[PDB]
Each structure stands twice: as structure tokens, then as C-alpha cells.
Design a protein around this nucleic acid. Sequence first.
RNA 1: AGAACGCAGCGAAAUGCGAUACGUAAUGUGAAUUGCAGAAUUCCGUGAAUCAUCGAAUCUUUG
RNA 2: UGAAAAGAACUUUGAAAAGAGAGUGAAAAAGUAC
RNA 3: CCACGUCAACAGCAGUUGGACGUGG
RNA 4: GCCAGCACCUUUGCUGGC
Lengths: 69, 127, 83, 490, 60, 37, 153, 84, 269, 53, 21
Amino acid sequence: MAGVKAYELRTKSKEQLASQLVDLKKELAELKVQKLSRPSLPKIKTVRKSIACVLTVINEQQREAVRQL
Amino acid sequence: MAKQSLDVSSDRRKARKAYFTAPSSQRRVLLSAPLSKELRAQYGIKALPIRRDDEVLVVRGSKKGQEGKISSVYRLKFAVQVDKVTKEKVNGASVPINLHPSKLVITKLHLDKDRKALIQRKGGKLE
Amino acid sequence: LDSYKVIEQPITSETAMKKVEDGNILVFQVSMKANKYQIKKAVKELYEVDVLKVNTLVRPNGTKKAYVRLTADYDALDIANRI
Amino acid sequence: MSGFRLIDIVKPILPILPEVELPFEKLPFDDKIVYTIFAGLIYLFAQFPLVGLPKATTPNVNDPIYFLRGVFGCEPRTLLEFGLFPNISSGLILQLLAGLKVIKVNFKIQSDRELFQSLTKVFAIVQYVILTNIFIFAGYFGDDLSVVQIGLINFQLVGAGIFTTLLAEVIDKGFGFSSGAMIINTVVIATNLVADTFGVSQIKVGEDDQTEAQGALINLIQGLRSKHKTFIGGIISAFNRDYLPNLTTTIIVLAIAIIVCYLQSVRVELPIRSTRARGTNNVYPIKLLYTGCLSVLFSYTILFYIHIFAFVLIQLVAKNEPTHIICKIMGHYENANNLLAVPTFPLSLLAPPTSFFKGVTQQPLTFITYSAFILVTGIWFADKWQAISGSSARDVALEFKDQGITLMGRREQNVAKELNKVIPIAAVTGASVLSLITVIGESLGLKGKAAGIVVGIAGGFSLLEVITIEYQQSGGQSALNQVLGVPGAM
Amino acid sequence: LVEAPVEFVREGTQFLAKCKKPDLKEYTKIVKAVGIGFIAVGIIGYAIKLIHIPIRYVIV
Amino acid sequence: MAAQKSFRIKQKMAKAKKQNRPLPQWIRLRTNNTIRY
Amino acid sequence: MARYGATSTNPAKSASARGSYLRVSFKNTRETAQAINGWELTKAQKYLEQVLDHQRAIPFRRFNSSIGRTAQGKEFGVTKARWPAKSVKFVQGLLQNAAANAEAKGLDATKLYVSHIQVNQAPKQRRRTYRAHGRINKYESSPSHIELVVTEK
Amino acid sequence: TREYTINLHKRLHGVSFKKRAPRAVKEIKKFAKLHMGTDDVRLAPELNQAIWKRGVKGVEYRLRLRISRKRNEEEDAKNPLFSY
Amino acid sequence: MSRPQVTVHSLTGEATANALPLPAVFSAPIRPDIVHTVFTSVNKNKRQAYAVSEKAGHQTSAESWGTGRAVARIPRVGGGGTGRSGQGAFGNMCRGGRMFAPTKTWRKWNVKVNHNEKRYATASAIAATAVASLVLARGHRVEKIPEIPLVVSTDLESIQKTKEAVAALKAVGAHSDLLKVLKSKKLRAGKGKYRNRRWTQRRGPLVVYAEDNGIVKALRNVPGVETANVASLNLLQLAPGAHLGRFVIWTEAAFTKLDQVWGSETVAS
Amino acid sequence: MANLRTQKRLAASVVGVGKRKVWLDPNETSEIAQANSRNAIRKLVKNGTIVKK
Amino acid sequence: RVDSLVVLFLSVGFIFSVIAL
RNA sequence: AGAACGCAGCGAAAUGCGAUACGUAAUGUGAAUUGCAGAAUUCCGUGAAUCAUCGAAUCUUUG
RNA sequence: UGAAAAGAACUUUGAAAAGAGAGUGAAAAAGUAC
RNA sequence: CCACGUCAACAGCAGUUGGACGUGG
RNA sequence: GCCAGCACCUUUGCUGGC
């Protein structure tokens, strides 16, 4: 609700999450480069690797769903 | 420190197990300093893993009788800075001063809700 | 689903910024597998364009420089005030 | 001369006057303080009158103008009746041209930065000579004459005004401390304060405005308190009367002083991180009202200049009888039916309504238009200030960024994009809110300086905050002696 | 009122919300700064008026 | 000589020359730094 | 740590200076160091300044190896003048530091005598000189560290 | 001024060797130093052209030179050493 | 009505009655050459070591492809280059590498234990505890007289409690001897600590019983006490380091249990 | 002139010459050194501060 | 360059000139 | 089995992982983590681990 | 190297390096391949 | 390579210079 | 595109030749 990992994120369905993810990736792509800025930020690191962390979640759910059929 | 016996490392390897193995929550063992006798009675324990807001007095050094809040303590170094002294150089070039937890005694606690519950609910060896 | 992002970052440098001024040309650094078509498509959907030339070459950064000319009506100043 | 060459530059006549040029030697610290007070002691001879015997005798010159006085840095009936007003105006004109972006100049190049500054002090003197003809066309002196002594008085004022621009330069180039424009502004608002409040009183009668009563602080407080050497007593608290309350000017100077001196102590805090540590660090406040100081000095100045709607250049066309393209349609400055006569209906609703009296509640409409104009002019000169270098938002963010990233290797990075969001919200709106509380400072009461005092002190403690930071952090003579001593390294 | 000035105004009300609000020790700085100003005020404005009065006295 | 062609082999060596170590200094202050390079 | 090494001074009647890891000869600056001497700073200075022009170098006691056959001087108990102005620049740089440390002192003024000066092996720079069939001989490029201390007499 | 003819019959047929000219320039510099009673002697590119024109071998024997002074004295000595 | 017969001493103790005879096995001439030989025989069997490594040679291909120049091949070696090697390294001659046999293992030492020699070794050892004056020379101090070597009760087994150990130790006096063991000289051994060498504490007394051990949980631990049985005991316990005349404490039931054997080995001198 | 290896090269480049021929003024040598750009040396050429032999 | 002394001298003499007239 | 080259805010040295690129997750712990400068996150219950998981979702190029 | 980097502030001198004096600490001929 | 900034090491002396050192292109 | 003249501080403009 107010953010952005992890109990909001992990059980969310999922089209909503994908749509949000590509627009949190537009924040970071607007803020690249450079525009990195100079920053780091910890937000730039976290959202870069929140794209990583929850692309594991989307591809995991597809993988586990395929093993239930 | 650690109790005898099972692993029979004589040995500077045994020292290296303390030095390099065991991040934060088995540095809980090596960041413990004895309680008093009033707050030993209060919670029934003996010693407590340090908080960054517990107040602690130095007992065994050359700096052997100063109180102060713990300003930082390091997991890799197992060593405590006490706030402060420090020791200035005149333009504000500034000094840490580090210490060892088993050379200290903790005076006033900040102790916390379910922090004290887990500690008083059996220890071990559930990690 | 086996595709990649093309644009890794835009390159900004002394010559890169000058290209923006000269004829509405951005320049990017795109993946080592990047193909011409996917650069054209990506820049369209990140900046609302039509690209009037893509040509690409190597850099010692390893990532492939991609020199992208853009339409006149686009305005490359205020959308480079947005990167 | 003409001949045949393609020119339009005024180039042979320019060295044939005898204007001025500027220092030459300087020394600190003892020398700087002695010379800066000396500059203010030549200013302090504002007690001597200007030449002109028929104006000096029977009319004694017309009534004092308590509106021009503070922003000009003047005093009527003396050598320095124009003060900074043409020097700042040449700065307004070239701020306007380079800020409208009609004439584009890049100010971090050496060559055309120096050109701007030299052109400003030439156009200050060009502005001075047109101003001196403007003031005798206003009909201030009570004698308007054909070419005789009205030529000589205008000459003298320019000659004492080329002196006051030379003082402005001399202090600025390091003969004295501070900037010489800042000093003359601050000592004029200062003169006015104790002339009115401490003063002295003298027994006379006079139909015209005469200084029968000054010393409002003395008259009020000692009347309230007891009896003195003087035989007085009894409390005069407040009135709407023609005889001044004495409490009126005492409260309003204090009322202004408390509210804008706390606005001056409003800063926007922007934190910076690690001291050689982990975690947060300094709270670093930034100085909004020294940035907006020259923005709202320009804003206050322009309200007196404009031909369409202002005091100075409409008082001329009100005086001037012939009616054509220019006429007193701009504003009527004349006698009125009203009890107190000042312009009856002008287009100058940009003219502030306050005086050495109580505020005016009787026209809210002129208040709204006045406030609206100076907020608009405050954000107009705010965007000109950003555009015409200074510490440029585009340049400093970009320049520090590439420089730091590649300062051998490598480096870790900055709070200057963290500054980048919050500085425009603070800068543009801080000029605007400074303009808003400038009109509030005027509305409380007093004039002859009411918006000139608020900016004068506002930029003074924000200048003080810069100098204290340079003293304690950067070093030298220092301010850390009071408190510092012990930070930590983790 | 459209999108650009509504965005600018709600940004600029965060500056006015973010006031460093009165501290007694910074009011002490104000009192001394204004009082250093008030003695400068005192010498300058007293000097100008006093000697003006003999100019009026000497010349009828 | 003949390899698996190609311009691509030259490109990955070209990157390797930049990404080369070279150089600095500030970590050698905080380590454990037994002289190297 | 270091100096004197002939410790008697003491520091309320002393001034001191040292060079450190400068690239000027071990062999020729030991002879200059032994020969400065002693002599106030102004005599030492204006022997070395005239040396640059004409006045040799400075006598060589023990490192007196041939060379041709020699010569004109001076030659005041020596006979083998040479002219390394390399080592003159080094000792002039030592003396100016010594005389500026001996100008904040506040002591002064007749006094003096260069009480000890000793040269330390900084080390030798080691480089090579080409010759025959892939076999290469040593080439030292001579350098030194030095210490200078002076005292009131 | 003064005008001197510098005797380059002396020693400047006896050198060479191969390298007369840089020795010869130095010889003119300290001959003119002695005659004028000065510190620096200017040596213009007029004189440098004059000695290197015929080129080492390769000198037009004795040369006339015009020389001025001096009373400056040390600080920024004027010895013109070309034609005054 | 007496021969080797002894007076019992309890730990209660403050004795009252009489004990069984002192053994016939406690006589034999005390022979220090056999005592030392057996001590080194037993400790060798465990002993081995580690040293340097690489290879136990030999990174390092060769035969002797030495290449002349001068001063020879010295003598040896080969492979190879800007290192390392010379020789080198492959030595010895080493300013880098190994020694002329890297600690060898390999190197079979041992002494195998003959049946006859082992039961002579135990018999002589038991007869070497029966002295008195050699206790002081070894370096442990006994105030109390006489009743020697000491004899204690069967009650020694049951404890358990820490404070009843102290109550036992006051009687045997002794006591001060075990306080010596908890005192610096105890200090800090260096690099010799790992394989034991050491720096620089002394031993204490040995307690022996019979039916047990006992060696119960609490009897293990105490400053320098050791605990043993008459069925199984050894010369490391009866005189550690082989400098005969340990302070030895025994318990009743030891005589009769020791006495009956078969086997075959018995006293003569 | 000092550090004008680069301004010999750049000035020569804009007049397309082998670097021997190009000429730099002695008096305004400081102002030639304050070029560094290829449109800065165009100004210097038109003034006649840099000429071509 | 003019002088800081010249401006100082000019002004004081100007003040003396104006007052009487 | 192994190996090339990438990845980072930094990247000397080590190994952690693959264009999602020292990632994180499921069991789990408790006041400090990101080596450090710096930029930040936490602190009376959702920050932070190999203390332990022969345990795991991702998985370029070469073999 | 040291318990802890406290890894040498500040001042004078020197083109810079460094030197002189001074600071830290139990000890600096413990001042950085210590 | 090109551009800008430097002299501790390297250049067979030396240095205000560099193919070196540092950083970008 | 190259070369030359006049105007201009430059960026430029006009005229002529190849």
C-alpha cells in the first residue's frame, strides 16, 4: 500500500505488479545515464535489484504453475 | 569463552574460527558483557548481547573507569567504541577508541519487548 | 520469451551532446547482441519518435555505441531535459 | 565629426568627459575597517545642503518624499539625492536584456563577463544624467527655471553621484569590507531610524512639513514614565489624529524588525551524510534571503521607475502640461479634494500605500494589485538570476558530477541532485515569499524605507550566515571557538 | 490553474512548511545583531540632525 | 592466424584492455593490503 | 628517530636539517660532507657558490682515483680536483634549509661550526648498461639521504 | 656607441675539429663581456645569423660590432650586441 | 601377627582400623633404565609429525639436466627459469624449498610389545611407587607422615560433589601440592603447545582404586590429579616423563585384586 | 610559447599544413595559447595572429 | 588606475565648495 | 568435471552470481548492516547472516 | 607496528619532496617491508 | 593515437619535456 | 571548395578569378 516490498509484493497478482515494475524501471531509466546523477542512490540499487528480485517471483510462479499441470 | 570439548583444534585454527566465522548472531556470544547484580536478579540471566543504546562502563584497560553509551560495535572486529572520549587533535581530526566486550560490565539497559523474551526462552541453538 | 532490453544506457559525452544540437541525434550504448530493428522500436516507445537512421559500431567500453538520428518535429532538447 | 566611416559608436566624446575610474590600493584588516567607516563618514555629511539660493530660502524645497528615500539610499535636500538608484537601474536594464534572452551572453567566459560589468557602470552614469533631468522635470525644488542655475544644480547632483558610484566601486573592490551598494543601503535605513525615533524636538509653527517633532521614543516613553528636565507627563497611546501618537512609529519599527528578522532566520535545511562514518551527518541550512536579496531589491526599484505605472516618471508627465501620446493619464500627481493629498487616481496601484502613519485598510483592491505585481516581479527576477549564471543550476550539478566521478578513478558521489530538487522550490518561491512579506512589512507601517529595511537586514544575517560558515568550516579567523571541539571518527 | 502551476505551488509550500522555527539562542543572535545595528543607527542619525540645526541658526 | 573468424574476438579483448586493473589506493588504506600491482 | 650521530649539541644551541631520498651521489657527497667544514654557513655557502663558477668542486681526500694527471687549485693537501656540480646542488639545498631553520632559532651569530654531517645509503638505483652477446652489466645511478647538524662553539 | 672589431683570426682558424660555431658564440659572449665591462651580453639573432650564414667553416673572419651601455647597472643591464 | 600388614586410612579419616598387606609386587629393585625405555616405547607408537610440503620434492621435472657455464651444474638440477631452481629449491642447497628428507612417514619406528616384557614393565613400575624420598626430588611436596604411599576409602567413588573432593584432599596433605599446580609457572606455552613441550608447569598426585573406574563424571577434572585403576594403568600415570618417584595415592581392595594373577610373573631380587 | 605542441598541431590542422609553415605571433602568444578549440583558431587566423607560409 | 586618495580628495573639496554657495 | 568474458556506487585483492547479474528466496535471528570515502536503511515485532540448511528461483559465452 | 590507528593536529621553513619544533600513546632508536 | 592535468618512478645526464604517470574522448 | 580585394573586433556580408 505504502510501498514496495515484500509482503505487498510476493503474493500480488501480478499483471498489476508487471505494469508497476516497468514504470519503476522507467524511473531508473529516466535517471540513467548520467543522471547517475551523482547519486548512488540506495534507491537506484534497490529498485534495480527489485526488478531482479521480483522477476524471480514472476518467473518462479510460471515455473511452479507449470509443474501443477 | 567457548566451552570444551568436541572439536579438538588445539590450534590457531580455533582462534580463526572465532575471528572469521560467525557474523552478527554468534557475535551475540562475543558481544555479551556481564550484567550487574540488580539487573541479573531482574531478568534471572547473567549476561546480555549488547544494544547500541545500552550504557556500559570500562573495567579492564588503561581507560578503566568511564561510563558511556555504545556509539558503535563491529561484527567483524568484535569490538566496541564507547561514546566519547575519543581524543581530539585540535582541528577535529578524531579518534575511535575500541574495546573488547568481556572487559566491560553493562550498567543501564534499554532492553526491549521480545528481544528479552527470546533470550530468556532457552538459548541454544535454534538458528 | 527470449529477448533483451537493447538500451543499456544512453552515452553522454562532449561529442554525444553536440550531436543532439546538430540534427536531433541521440546516441546510446546498447547490448552486444543488439540488432538494428530493436533499437528503432525501443527509442520509439521510450521517446515517441521515428528514427531517420540507425548505425552502430564498437567502443572499448564493449557495449556497442548506437548513433540514432531522429525526426525534426520531435525536439531533442526538452526530451534530453528528460534524460 | 562625420567623415566617411561606418560607425555608430560614441568613441571620441567618451574620453573627453571625465567620468571616473576606480582603485588602486587596498589593505586589510585594520585598513579595511578604517576605510569602510571613512566611506560612511563622507556619506554622513548628508547634513549639508545643495546649492541653489532661491529654492533654499522661501519655499525651503517642497515636502519630503518618503517612498524613494530607502531604495535610492538618499536623503532630500543634499548632495546625494539620487544615491544608488541609477546604479541599480543600469543593473535592472541589463538583467532584463540578458534575462529576456534578447542579448545572450555566457558569463563564465572572462571576456564578456568584464564587458557586462564595465557597461553597467557606464550606463549608471548615463542613467545618472537622464535622472538628474528627470528630477528637475518632477518639480521637486519648487522652482522650475529655464537654463540658468537649474543646469548647475543638476550638474552638482551628478558630480556627487559619480562620487557615490565610485564609493560603491571602491568598497566592492576591497578598499572596505562588504559591498558598497550594501553599505550605503544599510546606513540610509539606519539614518532614518534614529532621526525618527531618538531625534530631537524643536519649537516652531509651520503649514508645510517641518521637523517640529522627532524623537518619538523619547516623547512617548518619558511621558509614560515620569517627568524629565522637560515638563511633560501623561500617556498618549494611539489616535487617528494629525498630532502623531508617538507610539505609532515605535511599535511599527519593532513589529517589522521581529517578523522579517525571523523570516531571515528561516532557512531550508538539506542534510548531507557521513563524517567518516556510516549514517547521517550535517543539517546544512541554505540562505534563501541573500539569494532573493538582489531579486527583491530589483523588484522594489522597478516600482518607482515605470512610465506606465510608477512614482518618478509619472510625476514628470503630471507636472508637464502638454497632452499628447504622453499625458497625465499615466497618473495624476496634483492637489486633491482629500484631507491628505497624494496621487488621487493614478495607474500606480503599484505605488505602496504606507506612510509614517498607520496602515491603510480603506482600499483592499490597491493592496491586492500591489502584492500581485511584486510577487510576479519577484519570480521574474528570480528566473533571470538563475539564467544569468551565479551558481548555475545546470552547470554546478553537471560540473561537480563529472569532475567528482573522474577525480582519479573514481569517487563516491554527492548530495547535489538531492540539492537539485529542493533548491528551485526554495529559490523561486523564496524570492516570491520574500516579496510577500516585504508588502506585509510595509503594511505594518512606516515609509521612506519600509521595503528597503526588510531586504537590508534580510540579506544581512544571511550574509552573516555565509561568513560564519566560511569562518568556522573553511578556516582563518573563526567562529568555532564558541562551540565545536569534538566530533568522532567511527 | 493547470498542471504546471499546481505542481510548482505544492512544491513551494514545502519550503514554507519547512521553517526552522524560533530558538532562544538564535533570538539572542537577532537581539545582538539588531543592537549592533541600533548603535550604528544611533551615531549616524544623531550626527546628521544635530549639525543641521546650526545651519538654520547661522543663516536666517 | 585463422580463429573462429571474426571481428567479435577482437572486440572482447578490446574491452579487457580497459577493464584492466589499473589502479587506485583508498582500499589499500583500510586493508590488509599486501603490496600488489 | 635518526641523527646526530655524535650526539653532543644540545638543542638550545643547535639547528638541524636533513635531506631524504634525493637522487645525488653517495660517493661524491660523502667527500663534500667531510670537506664543508667548518666554517660557518656563509663560508660553506660561498665556497659552493664559487665552485659552480670556477672554484673546482671541493677537495677529495680518499676518492682520489685516476683520472689523468692533475692540476691547479687550491689542492691544499689533496691533488685530485674534480667538478661534480651535482653534489653541490644537493648540499646547497641542505644548507639553505639549515640556515632557515637557523633563522627562527633565535640564537646567532658568530658561533657555528658544522658539528656533524653524515650521509646514508638511500640506496643505489639499479639500471643496466649494454655490451656484448645478450650479457648486460650493472649501471648504478648514485643517490643518497643525508643529515646535517650544527652547533654553537 | 663604441665599435670594435673582434679578432677571430685568433683561435677561430685553429679550432675545427668540426664544431667551431657554438664555441665561437661563447667566445664572442665573454670577449664582449670584457670589453663592455658588463654581466649579460645580449647576442641577437642578427649575430646568430651572422656567424651561421657561411656556416662553421664558415665565418667571415673579423666582424665589426656595435655595442652600447650600461649604468643600469645589475638589475636589467642593457648591453645590445648587434647594431645600435 | 605382622609382616607387610598396614594400618587402613579412610577419608573420614582420621582412621580407626587396619588394612590388608602391602603387596609382594611392591618389591623389586627400582631400575630407572627400564622405566625410561618403556616410557619412550609407548610414546613413540602414537608419535608422528608434519613439516613442509609442496610436493615432498618435486614440482619440478628433472633428471639432472644441469646446464654448464661455471661453477659446474651445481650438481643438479634443471626445471626451470627465473625462480626457483638452480638447484634452487630442489636442494639442498635450499634457500627456498625442502630439506633432504621432508619428515618421513615412511620411517617406521615403533616398539612392538612382547607379552613377557610388558608384564615385567608393569611389575617394576608398581615396585617403583613403593619408595618415599624420591617424591620430593621429582618436585612435589608432602607434609604428612607416614602411611605411604597413601591409602584411601571406597567412598572415593560416589562423589560427584565438588566440596567432598576438597574434604578428601585435606586428609592426604598434599593439598598444597595441588595448589602449586594452579599457580603461574602454569603460564603460557608457545609454539610447542600444539605437540606439547611446553612451558612450564609440574604434575601432581595419582589416585588409584580397583573395582570401578571411578573415574566417574566429577573425578575427571581437578588441578593435576589423575585417576586410574589397578586393572589398567601405565607408566605415563605412574611416573610421567620417566623421572621415577611419583606421589601415588591408592585405595583399599588394591592388594587382593593385584595379588591374584595367572599369567605368571612374581617378585625376586 | 609554452605547451604549444598542441597549438602548433591544431593550428596546422585547420590550415591543412605540415606544421613547419604555420606561424604564431610572438606578442599575442598568450592569446594564441587561449584557443584549444577549432573555432577559436578560426578567429585567430582571420585577425592575422596565425598566418600561413 | 586612478587612486583611492584622488576620490577622497575630490569629495572633501566638493563638500567645502557646495556648503557656502 | 572445467574455462572464457561480463556484472558493481567503489573495485586494489579475493569469490559471489549470470544481461534479472556479490543478486535474493524459504526455514530463521534481534541491534546493527552496504569492505571504505560517500550516499542511506534500521533500531520496545518484517533492517541483517551462511553461525546452519550436500537446501533453492534465476542461469550469458565456451566445454 | 600497536590494547586501541590514537597512522602525527597546529606553527615556522622549503619550488616540491622533506626538514625543524610540536601532538598521540604504557613505550615512537614502536612512525608505516615499523 | 586525440584532448586536458601532472613529475614520485621511468628516459642512459637533466627537465618548465615525453611514447611515462593520471583521467576522459 | 580554393585564391585575392574592400567593410567588420569576431561570427559575418558584398565583389572578382580558377
